[PDB]
Design a protein around this ligand. Structure first.
Ligand SMILES: Cc1cc2nc3c(=O)[nH]c(=O)nc-3n(C[C@H](O)[C@H](O)[C@H](O)COP(=O)(O)OP(=O)(O)OC[C@H]3O[C@@H](n4cnc5c(N)ncnc54)[C@H](O)[C@@H]3O)c2cc1C
Ligand SMILES: Cc1cc2nc3c(=O)[nH]c(=O)nc-3n(C[C@H](O)[C@H](O)[C@H](O)COP(=O)(O)OP(=O)(O)OC[C@H]3O[C@@H](n4cnc5c(N)ncnc54)[C@H](O)[C@@H]3O)c2cc1C
Ligand SMILES: Cc1cc(=O)n(C)c2ccccc12
Ligand SMILES: Cc1cc(=O)n(C)c2ccccc12
Ligand SMILES: [Zn+2]
Ligand SMILES: [Zn+2]
Lengths: 230, 230
């Protein structure tokens, strides 16, 4: 078969529970014979800000800077900053992109938000038209593997946080589905800091075990119904 | 009068539609006699990454870096980096915090997500008790003023993007409510880039007119039913 996996990883501490989930992914996917690449964004000191430094050539309109217009142009001309094109090459080759991160404010850490903002540019990840089911990364799979401070019960329809699915919408639908990815079901590892060292061990092994059969999974239907019900 | 307002603004171009919305807010609140401060994040080159540089001096466990713990302890001992403390002082004094940004991936641009991640730290914005209705920032108002590339029709419940309220959840509930803010209804300026020079003038003046009576508004009820319900 032969599959390539990119893990986009956003945690500052190699000994953390996120680091353990990234490491078990690399170990199990490597064991299976997959080709594996990890973008460890804090180690890379990955630049999160969307600025005019991300285009190196003559701007389309140097008088009034529009990041979307300028990057779309720079993508077509090949004048994006090289850190963006280095990530795009990894995504272009990947069959599966796994994002591994702690939930910050019901979303990704800013450094990973900046990866989405800068790497998934128009022309590369989507065109207008050419989005959602027609997005440019059609054929690829994506998977969010998230850790939380809040417990699974806090993340239910009647807990303080509401259902976990509700915070997934901007990431699954607005970002990944928009770019054409098929979205695998999220891995959510709840409250590892509260949990006993046994329960943590179990959450790590549950992810490892799921990865054994990841290429047999079908995606979610990434719709408003799946996220919010009715 | 007397009221203080902090505008946290995330756009690269002063001549942009966002720039215009931020400047009319300054003009109108300043004309009312309010005390106004603007954090222009791009112009500040505001650091978005959550890293051990956010703690000055001596880590409270430099064997296993835990950002939430380290920053919580740093805030209690007055040892957070001065860019964060400078923003915390603006927020502590403010009665209203307005966020002005273009929607990037159904969320805030990464530089503003970095402001949320690094300024709204434990001890300052939330605690046990006091997430949500201990929002430690209770008493304060917050308002998101957002611009989009997609049209209002795209942002309906059966439109491609789903209702606008769907993507507001992590920002209004998961972040603003959580820290104790009362949330004013969002100001959403749909698709300025392709609007006429007069639709745009319409949207800027709706904003300026809204701001004339901002202090008479009651917060939205920041609940799952508001965002997703009927
Ligand atoms: C700015 C900010 C915003 C946040 N916003 C949210 C939010 O919106 N909602 C929310 O729910 N939470 C939020 N959190 C909390 C955050 O999501 C959790 O702190 C994070 O998810 C926990 O993951 P971790 O890897 O850092 O845990 P760690 O502290 O590294 O791990 C927990 C424990 O598991 C241990 N462990 C590591 N590896 C293994 C292993 N292989 N086997 C057994 N045990 C192991 C670790 O040593 C540790 O003791 C926020 C935190 C911050 C800083
Ligand atoms: C990484 C990225 C992700 C994105 N993700 C999304 C998303 O998830 N969903 C989505 O809908 N969109 C998304 N967009 C598109 C984005 O939200 C819009 O491009 C942005 O909101 C447009 O607002 P602006 O200020 O940048 O418009 P501008 O281009 O600055 O302005 C529109 C026009 O009005 C002019 N103008 C300035 N001031 C005034 C004034 N006072 N009166 C009249 N005209 C004025 C400007 O010069 C310009 O010609 C994304 C864009 C990027 C780059
Ligand atoms: C929004 C939210 C929910 C939650 O459950 N936890 C633990 C948090 C910890 C830090 C910051 C925000 C949260
Ligand atoms: C997610 C999304 C919806 C949308 O309507 N538009 C215009 C976009 C433009 C660029 C990137 C994402 C979007
Ligand atoms: Zn979807
Ligand atoms: Zn709420």
């Amino acid at each position: 078969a032969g599959k390539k996996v990119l893990i986009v990883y956003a945690h500052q501490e190699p000994k953390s529970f996120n680091g353990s989930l990234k490491n078990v992914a690399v170990d199990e996917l490597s064991r299976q014979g997959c080709t594996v690449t990890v973008s460890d964004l804090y180690a890379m000191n990955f630049e999160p800000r969307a600025t005019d430094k991300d285009i190196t050539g003559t701007l389309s309109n140097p008088e009034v800077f529009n990041y979307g217009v300028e990057t779309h142009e720079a993508y077509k001309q090949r004048s994006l900053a090289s850190d963006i094109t280095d990530e795009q090459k990894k995504v272009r080759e990947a069959d599966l992109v796994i994002f591994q991160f702690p939930l910050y404010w019901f979303s990704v850490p800013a450094i990973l938000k900046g990866w989405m903002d800068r790497v998934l540019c128009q022309g590369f990840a989507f065109d207008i038209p050419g989005f959602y089911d027609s997005g440019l990364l059609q054929g690829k799979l994506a998977l969010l593997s998230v850790t939380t401070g809040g417990t699974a019960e806090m993340y239910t329809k009647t807990g303080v946080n509401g259902d976990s699915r509700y915070f997934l919408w901007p990431l699954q639908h607005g970002t990944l589905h928009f770019c054409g990815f098929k979205v695998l079901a999220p891995q959510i590892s709840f409250a590892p800091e509260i949990a006993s060292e046994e329960e943590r061990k179990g959450m790590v092994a549950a992810w490892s075990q799921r990865l054994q059969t990841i290429w047999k999974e079908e995606p979610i239907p990434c719709t408003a119904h799946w996220h919010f019900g009715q």
